[PDB]
Amino acid sequence: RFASVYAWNRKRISNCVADYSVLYNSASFSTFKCYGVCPTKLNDLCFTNVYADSFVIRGDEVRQIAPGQTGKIADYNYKLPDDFTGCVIAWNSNNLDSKVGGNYNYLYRLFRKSNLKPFERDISTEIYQAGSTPCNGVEGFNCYFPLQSYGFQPTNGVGYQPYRVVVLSFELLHAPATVCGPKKSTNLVKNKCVNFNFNGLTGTGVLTESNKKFLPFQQFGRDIADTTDAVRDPQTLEILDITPCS
Amino acid sequence: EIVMTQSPATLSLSPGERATLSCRASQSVSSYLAWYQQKPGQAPSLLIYDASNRATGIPARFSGSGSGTDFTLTISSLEPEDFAVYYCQQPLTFGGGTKVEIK
Amino acid sequence: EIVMTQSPATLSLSPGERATLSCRASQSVSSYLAWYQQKPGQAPSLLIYDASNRATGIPARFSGSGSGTDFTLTISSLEPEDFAVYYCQQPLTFGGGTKVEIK
Amino acid sequence: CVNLTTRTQLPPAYTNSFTRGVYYPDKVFRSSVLHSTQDLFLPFFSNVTWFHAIHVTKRFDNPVLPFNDGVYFASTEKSNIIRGWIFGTTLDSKTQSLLIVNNATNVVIKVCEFQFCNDPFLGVYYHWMESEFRVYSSANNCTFEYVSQPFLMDLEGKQGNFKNLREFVFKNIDGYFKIYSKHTPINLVRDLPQGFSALEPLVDLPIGINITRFQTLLALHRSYLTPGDSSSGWTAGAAAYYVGYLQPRTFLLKYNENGTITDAVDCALDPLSETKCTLKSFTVEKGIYQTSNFRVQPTESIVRFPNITNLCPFGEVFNAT
Amino acid sequence: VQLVQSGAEVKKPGSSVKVSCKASGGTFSSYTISWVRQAPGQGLEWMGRIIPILDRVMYAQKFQGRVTITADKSTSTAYMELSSLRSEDTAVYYCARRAIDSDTYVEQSHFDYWGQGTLVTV
Amino acid sequence: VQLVQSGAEVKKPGSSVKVSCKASGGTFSSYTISWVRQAPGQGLEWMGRIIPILDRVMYAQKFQGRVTITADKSTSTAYMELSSLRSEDTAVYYCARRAIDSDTYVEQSHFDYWGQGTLVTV
Ligand SMILES: *[C@@H]1O[C@H](CO)[C@@H](O)[C@H](O)[C@H]1NC(C)=O
Ligand SMILES: *[C@@H]1O[C@H](CO)[C@@H](O)[C@H](O)[C@H]1NC(C)=O
Ligand SMILES: *[C@@H]1O[C@H](CO)[C@@H](O)[C@H](O)[C@H]1NC(C)=O
Ligand SMILES: *[C@@H]1O[C@H](CO)[C@@H](O)[C@H](O)[C@H]1NC(C)=O
């Protein structure tokens, strides 16, 4: 079950391994389009959070689920901000979301007075007046129940067939690693010139024991120059100083 | 629902005389009215729209005015061919109509 | 071509008893199987797809398992209405089928 | 669900925030540096509202206050009287609201469609055991819940001056309810100490709700020597709290060896503070320093457009036949 | 343009009356079709309307139960069924086009292209 | 949705048998149609399939020569001709829809919407 676009599942993904299974290479999706990230680098990157916005749309409106777009869904049902980090993933659902007489459990906002804000749900049943007559609770002549059903039926056109779309909204990791790709651990090498990754702060240097006393919440640390001075080892919590290689 | 009363029930005029046709609504219809002309046994033809504007194909002698609940049609000179039953159409209903007859 | 053998040829069960239906392929079909239920004189209706998944509209009592060449259907409780001939569909061929009869 | 009475009606007092309200703005360790940062901080020497919950004429207060851009909360007590907060936009079950309560045995953080009491409270009965929890009548459709590990709370009706100062900062950024705090020993009878300490982060809650108002939660004391009427049969163990508001400010923060913030300059407080921020120093030598610029602002708006009474024929171009 | 109506009929009370209005061109989506009752010698009563573009129908309260309205997407045709036929309910009835419409739901006011109607009796 | 099949017939051996499965909607391009033989009282045998979207047909080896399959783009109809009719080859046969398909050639597995079939004999 996916929501019609009126509401959507917004389950938050955290404290886990975001193995993205190179889904973009699975060919199970018609659309797999990333904006603030390269789709091939998703397994290297860490996020504080990933949110998966999950809903059903018509094929001709797949193109509207993108930042900065306009259209009936983009403006009244599901809006993405111009500034967006995440990936839009979509695929055909004829054998789940379509019924012979039409699946009418999927509805979208058709009649709205103003645009929807980025990422807010509408979930409204307010009767909309398209004319000058108050039509107060009349729901006819010139006013409408705002939510319209879709003719999701098995032999309709490809642009009318339902598609499942999931938008993965990303919060870049400003936090201790929370959501990351399928990284492998290594041993710890002190001294010598080492190319290191941790939870980010990728760089090269010589890792040595630190005499710094970090407060229990700090994790990381910097110099006057805004450079990394020291890093708390994500495992066992030893503080290591980072010295540039000669 | 919205209900309309028309007046006179019957309008008796000589050809060439001025006709005034009144329509009164129970509640406001804003400007959502249309006027139609009925020949006996027929469904009436469009004369006026949005409670005042002359419909395309209609002679300049026919025009209206009014708002909310109080509406009217002025026929500057009523010709023998114009002695029709005149009706006001409300959004979802119709008024009783005025039968216009030659005196 | 791909050929399938089914077992038992006939399954005799009391209503309410557990049924196990076996399908064996001559070569691998990966997961490309479907199960169908035949009423006498009829072309059988879809029960299972991709060799294990319950088809929409089918009760939870029917599910399968298996891969490559070895496949099976479990009917947790076989009801009087379920005493159908069960067939496994291979990519381009069908197996012999198991006739399920009431004991 | 009880409306309390016998309280008196007195105006709020106001106090000097001095140099309190600074917190670590980040997680990064810094050491032996002066760092300039912009964030929402309690301004130095601000006007803080002082609330009372002392029997004495009886005070309990516990009003609903604006949250605005985030708040500074501080309290002085000796017996676990000030226990929690309610945050949200309505607090009437129509929307998601946040309830944080330090109950004697478990700290509970929940976000639900709560129907709050219009005079919510907690309480302890003395023969010192908890007897009441009357905060809400409903908590449906819950989206967030956390409960801390069981612990023992000291409910004893201790005497003397206030012994425990607890300071908190409550902010709501991008759906995160950020809580900072510090616990220091005190010997106080009326106001906040004129000292300095930065608050440390405690929790960062991924909640996603709109907070415009909040209310605190105080415990009531009842006893065998008190009338049993639920509205009038109660007293207020002495406690007091102070509420300030955060404002955008630039501060120069001083990190000592081992990375503790030991001092700070509020760059908007006065001209010397501006000089100190400009120079990145807590010491200024003798001389003249430039500290930004001065400009006269307009106090009026004048048009003097020509007396053109003609309207443009857009209604002839448009609406044409 | 035109609404092509069904002819007249006489039926036993209780037997449903079903007629239709066929039209060429893109009228299913371009116009709203309304059904109006005209007892012979009388004025007009609104029965109901179908907005085929939105798959929605509105009815006059006095005609609820009595009137069912639908439409066919292939060769735009409006259909109406009059249930519970009574000899008292003898009338000429017709379809009319709500000329002011849009795919943006601009909203309707008046009508044109009336089909005049078909007499149905007992 | 539906496959509308031809009725039963009896013919002289050697006379070709031609039947069809008519369906409404965009089924020519959305689904693959397969023909299956069911002698009365028997199980099923695959005869062949037409992938109308790609203009291609595959046949069971035992049915090559014997079975010819085509399709009509205008009002998606599958057609099949059984050549060399023999009285031995008496069977009920039908069309079935390969439900999992795409214009990206996602590939088929199972079938649904079986037409049950038509008996053809001598
Ligand atoms: C408290 O007073 C308000 C009126 O200000 C009333 O609506 C509410 O029901 C009262 N609650 C209790 C517990 O007495
Ligand atoms: C503001 O502070 C002054 C002391 O400088 C005090 O006298 C006054 O009452 C305070 N007013 C408010 C509203 O806090
Ligand atoms: C830093 O930590 C050491 C630990 O031995 C302590 O002696 C020193 O006083 C601390 N410095 C400051 C400024 O707190
Ligand atoms: C032109 O039409 C608009 C409606 O679109 C109306 O508000 C305006 O008053 C009209 N202007 C004239 C000159 O009739």
Numbering used by the authors:
A (entry chain A): 346 to 591
B (entry chain L), C (entry chain D): 1 to 103
D (entry chain E): 15 to 70, 76 to 146, 152 to 345
E (entry chain H), F (entry chain C): 2 to 52, 52A, 53 to 82, 82A, 82B, 82C, 83 to 100, 100A, ...
List passages from the publication reporting this PDB structure:
The S-protein is a glycosylated, homotrimeric type I transmembrane fusion protein responsible for host cell attachment via its receptor binding domain (RBD) to human angiotensin-converting enzyme 2 (hACE2), a process that is enhanced by a coreceptor, cellular heparan sulfate. Clinical candidate monoclonal antibody J08 binds the severe acute respiratory syndrome coronavirus 2 (SARS-CoV-2) S-protein independent of known escape mutations and is able to potently neutralize most variants of concern (VoCs).
In the SARS-CoV-2-6P-Mut2 + Fab J08 complex, we captured two different poses of Fab J08 through three-dimensional (3D) classification, which we call conformation 1 and conformation. Both conformations consist of three Fab molecules bound to a single S-protein trimer. Although J08 binds to the same epitope across the different conformations we observed that Fab J08 has the smallest footprint on the RBD in conformation 3 at 658 Å2, followed by conformation 1 at 728 Å2, and conformation 2 at 985 Å2. CDRH2 appears to play an anchoring role and provides the most hydrogen bonds (including salt bridges) between antibody and RBD in conformations 1 and 2. A portion of the interprotomer Fab contacts in conformation 2 are provided by CDRH1. A commonality across the three binding conformations of J08 is residue R56 on the side chain of CDRH2 projecting toward the RBD, in a region bound by E484 and Q493 on opposite sides.
